[PDB]
């Protein structure tokens, strides 16, 4: 499977960014995770970021923090996440799906059976939150052995070394981290993996401004959840919600 | 590319988002150069010294051994002020703080200790200090809470995840992560992701070196074993430094098995948990089957990181540390005994060691052994759950 | 009859009951001999390095006094085991009980410090102790009474007179008065009748010994002036012995002035008081137009013996020694400005003597001035004290 | 004023040991106080021996720190007690009054003028309960300027040097401690003042004991306080003990 490849070629074709949103699997319940997921791709989404419930998030702001609070609550464990991703992918052939991890759920019961279940549900890409690619070799050979796309974070103010090795070691998208020019053409120089920029994109303009700046799209996660924590006492005004927000943020990335 | 080895034999590393490598790459250059300076060592040595105490005293405890074969010495942290051991750690990092040209520390703690601990070594040396603690930790710790604000520190409640120290750990990092050109990180056990475990080491080890040096000079022998209870590992892992090349002597770190280890109710990760990734590092730790991470029993609430140092872990694979665990009744009893026996009040973290040695007597009374229990810390915080249980006991 | 001079000038003696003169006599040829004999002071010097944990650090303050030409030293009798520097004569007292032949130990106390000194040298050292504490100090002092208990101490309620410290040494003399065969009293400070306030000065003396060596050693040079709190007149007299023949080192010693020496609620008897006759000596006290002895009011309890030792006053009376007061507002400021600037919490009874020390230092900023306050004890104890202060004053 | 001496010679002429008790003055109030201070006198006290409420009596066991704290609650001072002091002696011309006293209210305003009152008062003897014969010379010597005699305690234990100086600084009477045949002897050796014997004194069988003993008499101090103590509800009941125990004591003398 090669679906960012067909993705990023198929947008390259009609000159277009990548919209890309977050959310937290099985928040504020598998059943609402699901139907907020549904229409997330009807709204425009190019690719979807999935977040697995993790005790300790330590690199999520408070909106994620809660998210997973809401997930818990539900009683969403990773192993109805993996269901829920199966349905998913069988839902929808050919989007790109994406998860967003902790080390300790991927090493938990064997990195290697980790990817293996990851290529059974037919997810695209992983990204472990705290793992840096000094740490990643068991990671991105595991994931690339099981067809899975192992992404990496480049951060605001990357040397050389580091661009280089983001470079080298990601496939499908680099997560280009807002918080920059330099750092989309020395990506490109290296033959980086497509530049998507994400942290803090919640506005159309964000995402016509990435793309400009010459990266292949834009992530947004907290805004999504935003708009589920705003909306839990309304399920039916939460899809209508996030259905107005991803349309009009897809809108901005058609250049 | 780091200069030192992050990792004891399969434990340790540098777990963080890529966004915080920068920061532990930063500190450990800073610290490689701090251990190379004289001037910074005669700067530690003079603070240790002439603020915090040192050297510590070791008390023979004739009274708890007498009709045994068994000399017990306890090595005096509790005597340190702020009476534990986490003082002499949190004024070198204090000092690589400003060696890196930084004005504000962020620390994190359950109990509290450390964060007084931090909060102490920042007063005295101009440094803004946050404290991160669980929102049920400063519901619990109402003492140490006042302590740090008294000492000038801004204490902030956490209330994410289970509201206690797994949680302040968290918010630390997420803190650091956007503030460490000018904040220093100031992690309170010997554990987290490198160079921590190795800095908080190099920061304890005059507490082994000491206690190698008064053993000498009063039996003239090395100890046959030096006993030190396990909550992260900062304090076992400052008695252990300098006797781990001396294979003569046994190195015994003691968890708190809480409830009993049977029960599940237990701080027992190196033994009894299993190893995961979390808080910078590979290690045990107490996690669910699919790998949640839970927090850690004791009595002791000082002994409640759900982790212990990956160097811990490294020295219990290769045999040459041991460890073991003792039961908070087991605990109270040391505690009770200490009291009436030496007039020594000891901290229930430092009762678990305490306990461990006195088992090792009482088994084998006859079995001439030279034994240092490091006492790391004193135990008048203590004196109200230990009152409260033997008022809910009758007795 | 005695061996040494129960008088310094007109104030101490021996004012007891003519049933309890052998017993001091008795006493005071034990401490004759006793500080005669090198083996005693070598055991002595020995539970004061090993147990204890003397030598005590002296901390340079620079925080609390930068922009001025004062440079003040804390003597760091905080650091003691125990947390307060009643520790050092409680455990030569215990050597002279069993030198004496005495199993038992009788002590008074007021806020517990004494006490919880007098149950740990007990039990360190073998001895059965028993401590009589005013029915009003039971109710008030919970935490060193569990102390007591836990170090196998009998605890013994007085509710006689005004159920405080002046009826806890009322019972403890009329008990040794019986039972002094077989019992020691351990006299809590350095007065009561000869030759309680000469062994409790010598049993006190290593803090000015030391003081004077460590202040050698990093000035150069002698105190321009040392200060300590006065309740009884222990620490301070302990931090003066040594200096009093070096005539250019002022002796400071501050009583509480509790609400002001104006409102009569205080408890400064040496410059406010009037001579009198009680506990077994002629010196200032708190008492009555007519002669009944009145307590001593501080926001500090340990500073509350409504007396003062002889030789305090004596020193006083030839102009050796100045004595001055200082407020529970100026003593909980000093307490506020130590932790928030140095880290150290001090006890509220040391606070009286940093307060003075702070205004010699503010009151005249370019004065070049080598000052050394005694910091007698260490302020966990206080920090509820000092909150619910500043809960009541808003703040 | 030769007060001792006459009684003493008296009992001698009649065979006789002299029963002397202890009361606080002002206990349990200043009437009622004097009211038991003439009921003892009916009933045969040779002599008494009066405490004045101090607030730390050292040499006391409870039964008497109770008579103080009763004294002190109906706000008896030291004034008062001299004021009932001359009321007394103008009611009894030829009774001895002995004060039991602490050394501070001696001291007070001024030993030498404290003796003086006693003198004015008419009171005749002074016992400092915590001023030893070693510290004794000032408050000795002010007794006998003014016609007071010092009463010295001699200890179960006194040595030789001990029973010299009782001996030759007391007069009056020497107060014999009971907690026996050695000190009487070398006191009479000694040329001491007459011993009476005191201290747990509280039945007639110890009266006629100390007489054949050899002593001039007995004190009883906390069996009358004891009487007071137990009859607070009931003052007339409470003469009427007294009445009673006091002649049953003054009987036993009669040798
Ligand atoms: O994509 C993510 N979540 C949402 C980001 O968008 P926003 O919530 O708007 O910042 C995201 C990606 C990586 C991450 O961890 C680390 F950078 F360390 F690898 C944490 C969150
Ligand atoms: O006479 C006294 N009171 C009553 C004694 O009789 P009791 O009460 O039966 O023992 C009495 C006499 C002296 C004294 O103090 C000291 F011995 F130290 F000088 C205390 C009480
Ligand atoms: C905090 C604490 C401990 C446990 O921490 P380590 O890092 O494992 O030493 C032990 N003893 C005392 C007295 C403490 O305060
Ligand atoms: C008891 C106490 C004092 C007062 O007693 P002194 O005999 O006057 O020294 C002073 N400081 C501390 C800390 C105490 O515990
Ligand atoms: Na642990
Ligand atoms: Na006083």
Same mark, same amino acid.
């Given at each position: 499977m090669e679906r960012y490849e067909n993705l990023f070629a198929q947008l390259n074709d009609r000159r277009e960014g990548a919209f890309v949103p977050f959310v937290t699997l099985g928040d504020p319940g598998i059943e609402q995770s699901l139907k907020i997921i549904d229409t997330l791709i009807d709204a425009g989404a190019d690719a979807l970021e999935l977040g697995v419930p993790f005790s300790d998030p330590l690199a999520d702001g408070p909106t994620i923090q809660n998210a997973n609070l809401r997930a818990f609550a539900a009683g969403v464990t990773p192993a109805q996440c993996f269901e829920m991703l199966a349905l998913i992918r069988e839902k929808h052939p050919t989007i790109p799906i994406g998860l967003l991890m902790y080390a300790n759920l991927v090493f938990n019961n064997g990195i290697d059976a980790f990817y293996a279940r990851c290529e059974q549900?037919?997810?695209?890409?992983?990204?472990?939150?705290?793992?840096?690619?000094?740490?990643?070799? !068991?990671?991105?050979?595991? &994931?690339?052995?099981?067809?899975?796309? !192992?992404?990496?974070?480049? !951060?605001?103010?990357?040397?050389?070394?580091?661009?280089?090795?983001? &470079?080298?070691?990601?496939? @499908?998208?680099?997560?280009?981290?807002?918080?920059?020019?330099?750092?989309?053409? /020395?990506?490109?120089?290296?033959?980086?993996?497509?530049?998507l920029q994400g942290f803090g994109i919640s506005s159309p303009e964000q995402?016509? &401004?990435?793309?400009?700046?010459?990266?292949?799209?834009?992530?947004? @996660?907290?805004?999504?959840? /935003?708009?589920?924590? /705003?909306?839990? &006492?309304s399920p039916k005004q939460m899809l209508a919600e996030l259905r107005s927000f991803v349309s009009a943020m897809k809108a901005a990335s058609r250049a | 590319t780091t200069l030192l080895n $992050?990792?004891?034999?399969?434990?340790?590393?540098?777990?963080?988002? =890529? #966004?915080? *490598?920068?920061? %532990?790459?930063?500190?450990?250059?800073?610290?490689?150069?701090? =251990?190379? +300076? $004289?001037?910074?060592?005669?700067?530690?040595?003079?603070? %240790?010294?002439?603020?915090a105490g040192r050297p510590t005293a070791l008390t023979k405890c004739q009274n708890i051994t007498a009709g045994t074969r068994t000399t017990l010495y306890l090595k005096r942290e509790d005597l340190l002020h702020g009476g534990?051991?986490?003082?002499?750690?949190?004024?070198?990092?204090?000092?690589?703080a400003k060696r890196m040209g930084k004005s504000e520390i962020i620390a994190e703690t359950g109990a509290g200790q450390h964060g007084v601990a931090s909060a102490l070594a920042s007063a005295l040396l101009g440094l803004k200090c946050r404290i991160y603690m669980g929102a049920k930790d400063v519901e619990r710790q109402s003492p140490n809470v006042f302590r740090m604000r008294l000492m000038g520190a801004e204490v902030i409640p956490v209330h994410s995840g289970s509201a206690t120290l797994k949680d302040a750990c968290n918010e630390a990092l997420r803190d650091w992560s956007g503030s460490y050109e000018t904040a220093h990180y100031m992690l309170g056990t010997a554990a987290g992701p490198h160079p921590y475990p190795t800095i908080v080491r190099e920061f304890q080890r005059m507490i082994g070196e000491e206690?190698?040096?008064?053993?000498?000079?009063?039996?003239?022998?090395?100890? +046959?074993?030096? #006993?030190?209870?396990?909550?992260?590992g900062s304090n076992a892992i400052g008695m252990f430094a300098d006797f781990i090349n001396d294979t003569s002597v046994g190195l015994i770190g003691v968890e708190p098995g809480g409830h009993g280890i049977e029960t599940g109710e237990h701080g027992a990760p190196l033994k009894h948990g299993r190893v995961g990734i979390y808080?910078?590092?590979?290690? $045990? *730790?107490? =996690?669910?089957? +699919?790998? =949640?991470?839970?927090?850690?029993?004791?009595?002791?609430?000082?002994? +409640?990181?759900?982790?212990?140092? $990956?160097?811990?872990?490294?020295?219990?694979? #290769?045999?040459?540390?041991?460890?073991?665990?003792?039961?908070?009744?087991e605990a109270l009893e040391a505690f009770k005994t200490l009291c009436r026996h030496e007039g020594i009040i000891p901290a229930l973290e430092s009762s678990h060691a305490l306990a461990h040695a006195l088992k090792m007597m009482r088994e084998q009374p006859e079995k001439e052994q030279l034994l240092v229990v490091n006492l790391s810390g004193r135990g008048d915080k203590d004196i109200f759950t230990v009152h409260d249980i033997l008022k809910a006991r009758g007795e």
């Open positions: 549900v037919g997810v695209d890409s992983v990204l472990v939150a705290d793992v840096p690619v000094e740490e990643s070799a !068991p990671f991105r050979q595991a &994931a690339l052995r099981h067809n899975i796309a !192992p992404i990496f974070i480049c !951060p605001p103010n990357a040397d050389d070394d580091l661009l280089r090795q983001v &470079a080298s070691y990601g496939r @499908g998208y680099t997560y280009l981290l807002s918080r920059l020019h330099h750092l989309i053409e /020395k990506l490109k120089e290296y033959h980086a993996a497509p530049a995402v016509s &401004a990435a793309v400009r700046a010459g990266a292949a799209g834009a992530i947004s @996660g907290s805004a999504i959840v /935003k708009i589920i924590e /705003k909306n839990l &006492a | $992050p990792y004891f034999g399969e434990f340790g590393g540098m777990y963080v988002p =890529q #966004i915080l *490598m920068p920061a %532990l790459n930063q500190l450990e250059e800073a610290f490689v150069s701090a =251990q190379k +300076d $004289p001037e910074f060592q005669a700067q530690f040595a003079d603070l %240790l010294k002439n603020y534990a051991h986490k003082t002499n750690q949190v004024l070198g990092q204090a000092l690589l206690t190698k040096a008064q053993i000498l000079d009063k039996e003239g022998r090395l100890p +046959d074993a030096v #006993i030190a209870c396990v909550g992260g808080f910078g590092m590979k290690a $045990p *730790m107490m =996690q669910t089957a +699919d790998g =949640q991470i839970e927090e850690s029993y004791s009595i002791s609430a000082g002994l +409640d990181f759900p982790s212990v140092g $990956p160097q811990h872990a490294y020295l219990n694979s #290769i045999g040459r540390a041991d460890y073991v665990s003792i039961t908070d009744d």
